[PDB]
Design an enzyme around this catalytic site. Sequence first.
Site, PDB file in Angstrom:
ATOM      1  N   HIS A  41       0.814  -1.222   0.000  1.00  0.00           N
ATOM      2  CA  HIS A  41       0.000   0.000   0.000  1.00  0.00           C
ATOM      3  C   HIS A  41       0.854   1.283   0.000  1.00  0.00           C
ATOM      4  O   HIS A  41       0.291   2.378   0.130  1.00  0.00           O
ATOM      5  CB  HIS A  41      -0.969   0.001   1.189  1.00  0.00           C
ATOM      6  CG  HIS A  41      -0.314   0.240   2.515  1.00  0.00           C
ATOM      7  ND1 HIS A  41      -0.112  -0.768   3.433  1.00  0.00           N
ATOM      8  CD2 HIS A  41       0.167   1.370   3.087  1.00  0.00           C
ATOM      9  CE1 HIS A  41       0.470  -0.271   4.510  1.00  0.00           C
ATOM     10  NE2 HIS A  41       0.655   1.024   4.324  1.00  0.00           N
ATOM     11  N   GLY A 143       3.244   6.123  10.642  1.00  0.00           N
ATOM     12  CA  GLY A 143       4.583   6.023  10.106  1.00  0.00           C
ATOM     13  C   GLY A 143       5.296   4.723  10.406  1.00  0.00           C
ATOM     14  O   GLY A 143       6.414   4.525   9.916  1.00  0.00           O
ATOM     15  N   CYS A 145       4.358   1.628   9.581  1.00  0.00           N
ATOM     16  CA  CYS A 145       4.170   0.561   8.608  1.00  0.00           C
ATOM     17  C   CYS A 145       5.510   0.143   8.016  1.00  0.00           C
ATOM     18  O   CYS A 145       6.400   0.971   7.799  1.00  0.00           O
ATOM     19  CB  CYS A 145       3.218   1.010   7.501  1.00  0.00           C
ATOM     20  SG  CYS A 145       1.494   1.105   8.020  1.00  0.00           S
TER      21      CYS A 145
HETATM   22  C1  LIG Z   1       0.702   6.888   3.961  1.00  0.00           C
HETATM   23  N1  LIG Z   1       1.195   6.186   5.133  1.00  0.00           N
HETATM   24  C2  LIG Z   1       0.346   5.469   5.871  1.00  0.00           C
HETATM   25  C3  LIG Z   1       0.798   4.797   6.999  1.00  0.00           C
HETATM   26  C4  LIG Z   1      -0.201   3.974   7.821  1.00  0.00           C
HETATM   27  C5  LIG Z   1      -1.260   3.370   7.154  1.00  0.00           C
HETATM   28  C6  LIG Z   1      -2.180   2.620   7.872  1.00  0.00           C
HETATM   29  C7  LIG Z   1      -3.341   1.955   7.129  1.00  0.00           C
HETATM   30  C8  LIG Z   1      -3.065   1.001   6.160  1.00  0.00           C
HETATM   31  C9  LIG Z   1      -4.103   0.387   5.475  1.00  0.00           C
HETATM   32 CL1  LIG Z   1      -3.731  -0.843   4.237  1.00  0.00          CL
HETATM   33  C10 LIG Z   1      -5.422   0.728   5.755  1.00  0.00           C
HETATM   34  F1  LIG Z   1      -6.434   0.118   5.078  1.00  0.00           F
HETATM   35  C11 LIG Z   1      -5.704   1.687   6.724  1.00  0.00           C
HETATM   36  O1  LIG Z   1      -7.038   2.028   7.015  1.00  0.00           O
HETATM   37  C12 LIG Z   1      -7.456   1.575   8.281  1.00  0.00           C
HETATM   38  C13 LIG Z   1      -8.981   1.677   8.406  1.00  0.00           C
HETATM   39  C14 LIG Z   1      -9.590   2.924   8.486  1.00  0.00           C
HETATM   40  C15 LIG Z   1     -10.973   3.018   8.602  1.00  0.00           C
HETATM   41  C16 LIG Z   1     -11.751   1.866   8.645  1.00  0.00           C
HETATM   42  C17 LIG Z   1     -11.144   0.618   8.570  1.00  0.00           C
HETATM   43  C18 LIG Z   1      -9.762   0.525   8.452  1.00  0.00           C
HETATM   44 CL2  LIG Z   1      -9.002  -1.084   8.357  1.00  0.00          CL
HETATM   45  C19 LIG Z   1      -4.660   2.299   7.411  1.00  0.00           C
HETATM   46  C20 LIG Z   1      -2.037   2.476   9.245  1.00  0.00           C
HETATM   47  O2  LIG Z   1      -2.968   1.720   9.968  1.00  0.00           O
HETATM   48  N2  LIG Z   1      -1.010   3.071   9.864  1.00  0.00           N
HETATM   49  C21 LIG Z   1      -0.874   2.911  11.300  1.00  0.00           C
HETATM   50  C22 LIG Z   1      -1.204   3.954  12.157  1.00  0.00           C
HETATM   51  C23 LIG Z   1      -1.062   3.755  13.527  1.00  0.00           C
HETATM   52  C24 LIG Z   1      -0.598   2.528  13.982  1.00  0.00           C
HETATM   53  N3  LIG Z   1      -0.289   1.541  13.134  1.00  0.00           N
HETATM   54  C25 LIG Z   1      -0.415   1.704  11.815  1.00  0.00           C
HETATM   55  C26 LIG Z   1      -0.110   3.805   9.199  1.00  0.00           C
HETATM   56  C27 LIG Z   1       2.152   4.893   7.314  1.00  0.00           C
HETATM   57  O3  LIG Z   1       2.686   4.237   8.429  1.00  0.00           O
HETATM   58  N4  LIG Z   1       2.958   5.627   6.540  1.00  0.00           N
HETATM   59  C28 LIG Z   1       2.488   6.266   5.463  1.00  0.00           C
HETATM   60  O4  LIG Z   1       3.225   6.910   4.794  1.00  0.00           O
END
Ligand SMILES: Cn1cc(-c2cc(-c3cc(Cl)c(F)c(OCc4ccccc4Cl)c3)c(=O)n(-c3cccnc3)c2)c(=O)[nH]c1=O
Lengths: 301, 303
Positions: A41, A143, A145
């Site tokens: 992603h 951040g 991920c």
């Molecule tokens: C662009 N971007 C994004 C991320 C990143 C993405 C995510 C993330 C990844 C995928 Cl595939 C999602 F479907 C998602 O929607 C979650 C959701 C929302 C609403 C209803 C159901 C669901 Cl399921 C979220 C994330 O959950 N986190 C995270 C945050 C806090 C703790 N752990 C993980 C971080 C990143 O780290 N860096 C970066 O640049």
Amino acid sequence: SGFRKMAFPSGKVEGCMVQVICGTTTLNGLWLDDVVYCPRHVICTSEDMLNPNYEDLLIRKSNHNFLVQAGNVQLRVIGHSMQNCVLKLKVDTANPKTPKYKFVRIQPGQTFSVLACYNGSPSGVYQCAMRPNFTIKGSFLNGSCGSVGFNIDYDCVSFCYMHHMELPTGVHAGTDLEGNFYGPFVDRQTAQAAGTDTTITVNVLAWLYAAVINGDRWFLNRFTTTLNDFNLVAMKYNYEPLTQDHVDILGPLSAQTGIAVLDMCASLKELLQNGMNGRTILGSALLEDEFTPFDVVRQCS
Amino acid sequence: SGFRKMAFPSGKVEGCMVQVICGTTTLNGLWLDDVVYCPRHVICTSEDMLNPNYEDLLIRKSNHNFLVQAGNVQLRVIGHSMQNCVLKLKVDTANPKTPKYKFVRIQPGQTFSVLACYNGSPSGVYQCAMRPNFTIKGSFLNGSCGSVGFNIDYDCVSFCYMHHMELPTGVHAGTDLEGNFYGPFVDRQTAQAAGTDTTITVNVLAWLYAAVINGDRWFLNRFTTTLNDFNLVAMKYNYEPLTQDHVDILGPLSAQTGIAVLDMCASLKELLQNGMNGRTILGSALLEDEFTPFDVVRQCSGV
Ligand SMILES: Cn1cc(-c2cc(-c3cc(Cl)c(F)c(OCc4ccccc4Cl)c3)c(=O)n(-c3cccnc3)c2)c(=O)[nH]c1=O
């Protein structure tokens, strides 16, 4: 003595963490040999996340769209391919700090250490376990991920987890290093909810054995139980059923302490019925379920 | 979100751990530049440990009584000296993996990471706190003597602890990297026990703030106490006094949550009297006190 939740020394994993940038996205990557692994992603915008066509989005990407940075060194991407939910970036330099490693898929109840990373920079390490509902109860911020979970055996790092997302309940879902999600989850922003979580019974029993080894016996009783009678009781407390396989892997702890597995099941049944009554076991006021039978023999016996 | 007992990444410290043998004793050493640090009691036999004369024991010892193994590469000891309770062993080769480092002494209530080692090889890492009675509740087996505690600021490793011994209650005693013991303990096989330990009040409050940040809010209330009324209740449950400096550093968490410090004390006082009795906070059935306010801010908001 003493008994704490020890994580593995993170040095061999720190040497592999890099930053992967694609468009507006910044997350972590795992640099092993000339391949950088990261969640697929990374190629998505926020509009894609509801129903992303990953094959369609990746074929539109060229190697120079991916910015990889290892410290102050920028790696040049010379190719990419997708394996399940993990993106694999081929680079023109092999990581000189690549340890001896292999990829493994773990089962619920198994434990591992997590190296939480942000912008490719390791920030903290902690121990956790794969829950029976295939989530992990981690500590993750935006951040994080691309952070990976791992065990180290002798000098071989077994990568078992890559962090992908946080669910609405604050728990976390991810994949193995072959891109296959643990549980029924998908890298989609649609409605996803983890099933009811349960206590890892075989791990609690192993932890009670470690308590006896360290001199705690106040919870033992004079009772025994059958396997079926224990499960009918324990499942009323949302404990996982204990199987004959579980009974067998506790044999070493049963033989070392002279307490039969079904005798310890009788103690656990009584603990679930009485609670702690102000007491503690190995410094905890609740029953710990994130120590495996393997972990117990390691730090203790 | 989520909250776990988090240790620093241990890589910069793993590259400094060596094995030190003196006769039959085998323990761990810290290899920084061209010096290996380890507890001075490595030179003692079991009869020596009963009443050691360390200066006489060391004078009657040679550079050849010290075998230093770094992985599979032997390190020739070219000189040795004592600083307090820490033995320093000069070697021929400076450690190429020496990080930016400095020796610091920490105060009770402050936390640090511990890299538990055995025969010079790192085995595990965990986070702990310097107890008010100057012990640490660690996890150590035989051979862990010489394991170090540390914090990391940017790229600089602040070594703050070296493990020396276990006390009869299962807790652990050690020194800073300059050989000064934490607490009223001596490196001799004698009858020593730790004083009555107490709970680190400022850490519990920071932990309750981390709970609020993560959605656990049942323990909150509308009431406020005073620092005097609270400390009168705290002294009865073996809780450390809450000072004005403690309230000040909880300030960032107070502003970020909208819960004033003396409100959280009212919540803590009620939890002290009325108990928990199985009800949990951040998945814990007891009040955690090994997270500083700075630990909470670094983990919950990444500041
Ligand atoms: C662009 N971007 C994004 C991320 C990143 C993405 C995510 C993330 C990844 C995928 Cl595939 C999602 F479907 C998602 O929607 C979650 C959701 C929302 C609403 C209803 C159901 C669901 Cl399921 C979220 C994330 O959950 N986190 C995270 C945050 C806090 C703790 N752990 C993980 C971080 C990143 O780290 N860096 C970066 O640049």
